[PDB]
Amino acid sequence: KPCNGVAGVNCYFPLQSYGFRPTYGVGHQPYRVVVLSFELLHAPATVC
Amino acid sequence: NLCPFDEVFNATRFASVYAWNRKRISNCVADYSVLYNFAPFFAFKCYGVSPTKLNDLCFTNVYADSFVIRGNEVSQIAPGQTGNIADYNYKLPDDFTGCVIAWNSNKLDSKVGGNYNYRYRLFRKSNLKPFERDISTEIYQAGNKPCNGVAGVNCYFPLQSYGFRPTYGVGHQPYRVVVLSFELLHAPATVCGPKKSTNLVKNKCVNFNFNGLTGTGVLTESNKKFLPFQQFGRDIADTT
Amino acid sequence: QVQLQESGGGLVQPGGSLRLSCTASGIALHTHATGWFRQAPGKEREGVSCISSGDGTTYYEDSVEGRFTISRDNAKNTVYLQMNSLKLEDTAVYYCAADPGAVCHSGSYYYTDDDFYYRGQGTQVTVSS
Amino acid sequence: QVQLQESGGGLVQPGGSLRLSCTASGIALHTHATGWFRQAPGKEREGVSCISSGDGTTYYEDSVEGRFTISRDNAKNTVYLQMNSLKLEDTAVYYCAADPGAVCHSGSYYYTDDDFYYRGQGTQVTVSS
Amino acid sequence: TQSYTNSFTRGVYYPDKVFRSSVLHSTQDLFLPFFSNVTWFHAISGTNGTKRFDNPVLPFNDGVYFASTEKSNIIRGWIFGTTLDSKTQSLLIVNNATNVVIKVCEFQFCNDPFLDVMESEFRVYSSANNCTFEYVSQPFLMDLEGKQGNFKNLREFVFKNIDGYFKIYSKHTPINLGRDLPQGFSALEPLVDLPIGINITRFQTLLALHRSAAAYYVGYLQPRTFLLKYNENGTITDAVDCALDPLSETKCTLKSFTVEKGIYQTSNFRVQPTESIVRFPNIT
Ligand SMILES: *[C@@H]1O[C@H](CO)[C@@H](O)[C@H](O)[C@H]1NC(C)=O
């Protein structure tokens, strides 16, 4: 079915939310993630 | 080769729960989009396989059966279900897959005087094994008195019949259930389904797959001959 | 070959009390629904009371409300119909009957239509002075 | 603009069966958790059943165990509440509600607390004689 | 009868379905060794109706070669199975007049084949429990009609059961002359491949035991390396065993069929240990 319309079957909304009730137990409990991706090579390095 | 499903699905009179028929068919085209016209229904609960995908998946063996029940226990024919109507009459395996169809059958499974051709069991010794049918008619021992007589006190008849009337409403309205049970396994190696493929080409460098081995090359006709049992062709150093 | 046996009845003074009993031989109770139907001379048979299959919803007719009670026990497999405050017009023969399933008041149906599969001989209850 | 519609309900006889259906317009199923909450006049709203996000673990309340079943069809994006053998205290209006995540019985939390993000208008079902 | 007789150049079969032309191919597979001894079971005539005990039970280790030669069709039937009782499955192959039936499931009682010194007197089983895979196809033994004396058909079979598959290899050679086990070489054509998956520990042979040198053969296979000659044309023409003679071993290692004059180093001779002494210190 064409999805020029906003709602309806076979035509959904792309973003999707998810809840953090405090009574949840370590299965959906929140976790802050910071990833530090590195590049190491003989190069004009700036961070030491 | 082909099998008809329209005559398998329907019967002149649906058998009772305590003695159900079952038909096993294989080696035919697994076309399942044709049954929409030969059977009235509303749900078409095909849990495992999508209805539009059934034209390509290969099935080794399938089971087809049908039985009439009351409308109060439509959902009782399901895995993990308990009760008198399921544990002693008909219960599904806990890993069941397939297509279960239920329809409200009042125009064809009810009479004004009361249809009494439908039977079930209510008293039995213990829970029965999955996919097992009991047709014995013996008086259940439900009391301290020995049940040696034909009938009497503390000796109850196990086979109980349904009383159906069109004046009833829903819930007690009779229902018909058609179950198509699927299983996936190996070993016969001849009951495989839609694996058919086509369009050979010749005298061009193409990829090929012949009953298990893949390769790349050009294919031509040669003045060889094989014995009728030989399939492959080979030479020095194990090359096709 | 299932029979239904009735016991009770007889000559009872108006304002008295009785207890009719119906016992099933072949079938068991709390699986069928058992009703009572009374018949008078020169009249047509009319129901009295019923108990459904599971647990039991007690239904009563218009002329027997507030006076007649129904009960059922599965230890003796017997349905009991208790007569209290009998008037002079209750001289009749009583029959117990059983039908499989919750026959009494399911959907747009009601147990006035006498189409019960099992029947009985019946007992006579007479009020006189 | 996400709207949840319910279809079904009406006058059904005690001991009957019925199929309520709830359909989501904007959001899709098998990602959310869908529950049913019933309300009657004179009392506060109480849940009925729930389906989680993945596959679906069916949870049922104490008063509706064994009688009510819930199912979810992603081919029609519709959740189905099948209720059978209705007693006289089941006269109520039913609402379907969708919540993000596998909210029903994850950790020490349970879906009795009515805090679902999406709601509906509900349909009335009435059992009477 | 338990007489022993050697088998010269019999007990070969095509190991696979491939096609090879004008080559010598070395394979390691279960085979019947060259110049191996085989036993002769013989069914007596049995004029009286009591007993003959001509049909004993055989061990069935790792594949069985079978052979027969006779004018009539007395030899008909083979039953397999580890127990042949009421608890475990058992396989059956009965040839009809122009058909076969292969039915594998439990056979409770098989007292004896019917012995009436023929029309419809094979009732060997009484009760049949639940089972599946009743396979019916073109009959295996086809009747080569003998005539003018000294000319009878020679039926040759190999029965194998590995990794859940039961394989029968068969060939009918009309030429036997006056020798029961004559000279010559013949490969065996595969016929069927039946998937069952049961283990086989015992088997028994069904005979037309009404009334009847033994004209009946049985042989035991071992995993023996052979060298096979594939002609230009698809057929195995000759074969060389690899553990029969030192000439056979040097033919196998040289990988050609013919050998020239000289010395050839073939394998290694090593002395195996006889005992295994253990010498620990005396501390209780
Ligand atoms: C090879 O096949 C040919 C061609 O059909 C056949 O005539 C002949 O018997 C075979 N030649 C041999 C085995 O030398």
Author numbering:
A (entry chain B): 473 to 520
B (entry chain A): 329 to 568
C (entry chain D), D (entry chain E): 1 to 129
E (entry chain C): 22 to 138, 148 to 242, 257 to 328
What does the paper say about this structure?
The SARS-CoV-2 spike protein is the top target for antibody therapeutics. It is a homotrimer on the virus surface, consisting of three copies of the receptor-binding S1 subunit and a trimeric membrane-fusion S2 stalk. During viral entry, the receptor-binding domain (RBD) in S1 binds to its host receptor ACE2 on the cell surface, the spike protein is cleaved by host proteases at the S1/S2 boundary, and S2 undergoes a dramatic structural change to fuse the viral and host membranes. In this study, we discovered a novel nanobody, named Nanosota-9, from an alpaca immunized with the Omicron BA.5 spike protein.
